[PDB]
Design a protein around this nucleic acid. Structure first.
Lengths: 7, 90, 98, 95, 79, 78, 95, 102, 90, 8
DNA sequence: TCAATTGGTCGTAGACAGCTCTAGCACCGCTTAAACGCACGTACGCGCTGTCCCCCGCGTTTTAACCGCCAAGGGGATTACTCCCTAGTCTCCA
DNA sequence: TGGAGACTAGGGAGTAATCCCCTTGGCGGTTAAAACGCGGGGGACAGCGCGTACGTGCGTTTAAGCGGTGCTAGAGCTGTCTACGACCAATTGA
């Protein structure tokens, strides 16, 4: 579960 | 001045297998120390303007909304308000 | 303090920096938490685009070139870092059509 | 080769690179010659001269971008000192 | 003396090519030399002001970084 | 809706103050868009400064500060 | 009078006066329209709207001064939207 | 006597001292910092007022208005570099027509 | 910062004895003095911070003046500041 | 004597 | 081994309730100054054609940048005396 | 009712000494880059023609601006009082 951005 | 450990650690949770050059982290240290002094100078102004003597998360919120563009502010404010909720949660 | 917020950036060091930087006579309690959550989110946002640029170049490390390539190719980060020079970063490949 | 194709290849070559395009020793001597007018016997950290070169090269590349825009505005391909002056004046560097 | 000629025509057109320029007039090289001299004189003056305020004799990369900040150009990667 | 209240005579007066001799017909809509963007940028910051102080009226200082932070410091309004 | 000495007379007239060249009521209405997109039931000081107008008109006059320079650069006396675009791109407002 | 008349100034060095100590610039403020600041502020004020009163007298007026301040600043290269991002309210512009248009 | 109107009036009185000043020109002069004050004091604060110093003194103010004021304006302002401190110390 | 500058 | 946290006073900074009166808004009427629409002509933008000069590409020659590798000394960080320095406090009528 | 004068005390900065590092200076070799000449060609600039779009003037319309009237939101200032951050002491681990 890599930390990604919702932008 | 040196945020190298934390820039490394955030890197591992977004790109676990990717590294950073010495010059590339000497650059992100400059970025962090620049944006910190941007927010802490706008929030310092926002306290003086209201004749206020303490800088709060409200002033950090307002400084972030003044300095960061468009959807960066919307997504940085939503993360600042979530880390304080968790910081002061029993 | 960093663990309670679920952060990785140092809330205590941000606190000491805010107090030493004479930004105000007093510094609150959620101010360092908010500021660290803001700096860490921005750091993670740059470090994702630069690192996507590293795979787009078939690299396993991030160099100033990748950071510049990520900043200038993002409108928000480009506007934020618009008057910023990145050492050994180059420029965005761009030739006018006359 | 036809005049221009090597120019486009050179643009592509130097636009994907990140190295400094001015030789370091002549730039260092220029920097010390300039600084001699503000203080004598002035030492320089190597990082100081490197920062000056990086800033100067980024500034000149960014200014050449504007000069090229002013060249295209006058329906030309060749950049002339007229274009540099227009870019510098609109930027506020000049009057 | 005359160290501005060390910024040679090939280096100037290398910077121009990085700036996306195809053709260059023969008078561009002297104009670019003058512009670079102006910029460097403006930066190395604030840098030496910062140096003399510290009562130092070496110009530090931090003095250059601050002298660039004073003119609105932030530099990343030199501390 | 009130962007057409910045009339063509007004834009032409602003251009004549700028020294412009001839004005093309497509200049007026371009000027209206540019003024709209400028006013939006200043007013967003001024309203941010207004809501921060928990006020409901935008103060002249709120505009002056929203201009100071875009590098357009204005003398005369305190 | 021919086509263009009245333009020079107007340039001399409006470069000599210091009045506000935009009518106050429509500009005030525009300011209120734009502000309503951010906050509802927003009130304004008269000095706030006057400061906004004083800043906007100076910004537009200064931009027209650069648009004129871009027009002269292209061997023209008519300013066109491409001149506005070049001036704004060079002063970094919007690439 | 007074701290401004001690230095031979007209600007209030006591007021500058209070503003320096209240603005969160440093933990401490030296004794000559308010005097130096008051002297520099007075010198710049005197420069602008001298040039503005000269410009107003070139317009056959006996009162300085913001137009005269703008004329004085924009006609001086050093003051123009100083106030180069400053908008003067009700100041207008310098009368300048391009030589091509004429 | 409440106003410099009295002091700008005294300076005008001693510079142009007959010329008066408008009520709108005085607001601009007060804005000018408040802006220049902020510019010099902020640079002096940055100067003290770079040197790890907790006091702002005449040297910091003078170096901030030299950094901020352009050309011969800086030379003459430095001379007036120096003369004022020299006479005040005496 | 009016306070007249020595500046250029 | 010092920094990053924790626990407990204390005093003041700031939140909240309550007036106060300023000024911001909403509206109307009159005047008229300014905007708007149209008709017209001409000047200016723009599209060609042609000349020729200056820039580019390339093949030699030269020059000095760059890279190691020594040698010396200035001068930038430190660390402990030393005192002069400003913040703080009280009086106080300009 | 603010800043000026006069003490008191802690401590921030000035000073002397040390120490080592890093900046400068020299030298030699190699070769990569700069410089120079030459020969075209393509792009800059000038001249000309055309046509259309912009300035100009005139007549009509339409809201801007000014001068009043009135109403009330809310900015601004007290007054209270509590809760939150500064400060200090423990404390314990990365």
């Amino acid at each position: 579960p890599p930390r990604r951005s919702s932008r | 001045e040196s945020y190298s450990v934390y820039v490394y650690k955030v890197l591992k949770q977004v790109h676990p297998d990717t590294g950073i050059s010495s010059k590339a982290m000497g650059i992100m240290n400059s970025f962090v120390n620049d944006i910190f002094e941007r927010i802490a100078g706008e929030a310092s102004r926002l306290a003086h303007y209201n004749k206020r003597s303490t800088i709060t998360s409200r002033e950090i919120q307002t400084a972030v909304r003044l300095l960061l563009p468009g959807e960066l502010a919307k997504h940085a404010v939503s993360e600042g308000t979530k880390a304080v909720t968790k910081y002061t949660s029993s | 303090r960093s663990s309670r917020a679920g952060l990785q950036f140092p809330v205590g060091r941000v606190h000491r920096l805010l107090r030493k930087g004479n930004y105000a006579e007093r510094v609150g309690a959620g101010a360092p938490v908010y500021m660290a959550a803001v700096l860490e989110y921005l750091t993670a946002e740059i470090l994702e685009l630069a690192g996507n640029a590293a795979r787009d170049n078939k690299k396993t490390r991030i160099i100033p070139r990748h950071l510049q390539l990520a900043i200038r190719n993002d409108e928000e980060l480009n506007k934020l870092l618009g008057k910023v020079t990145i050492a050994q970063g180059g420029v965005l490949p761009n030739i006018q059509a006359v | 080769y036809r005049p221009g194709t090597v120019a486009l290849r050179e643009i592509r070559r130097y636009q994907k690179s990140t190295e400094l395009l001015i030789r370091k020793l002549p730039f260092q001597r220029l920097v010390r010659e300039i600084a001699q007018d503000f203080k004598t016997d002035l030492r320089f950290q190597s990082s100081a001269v490197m920062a000056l070169q990086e800033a100067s090269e980024a500034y000149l590349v960014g200014l050449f971008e504007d000069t090229n825009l002013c060249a295209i505005h006058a329906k030309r391909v060749t950049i002339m000192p007229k274009d540099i002056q227009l870019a510098r004046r609109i930027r506020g560097e000049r009057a | 003396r005359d160290n501005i000629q060390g910024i040679t025509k090939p280096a100037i057109r290398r910077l121009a090519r990085r700036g996306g320029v195809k053709r260059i007039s023969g008078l561009i090289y002297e104009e670019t030399r003058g512009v670079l001299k102006v910029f460097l004189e403006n930066v190395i003056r604030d840098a030496v002001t910062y140096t003399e305020h510290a009562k130092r004799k070496t110009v530090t990369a931090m003095d250059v970084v601050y002298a660039l900040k004073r003119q609105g150009r932030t530099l990343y990667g030199f501390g």
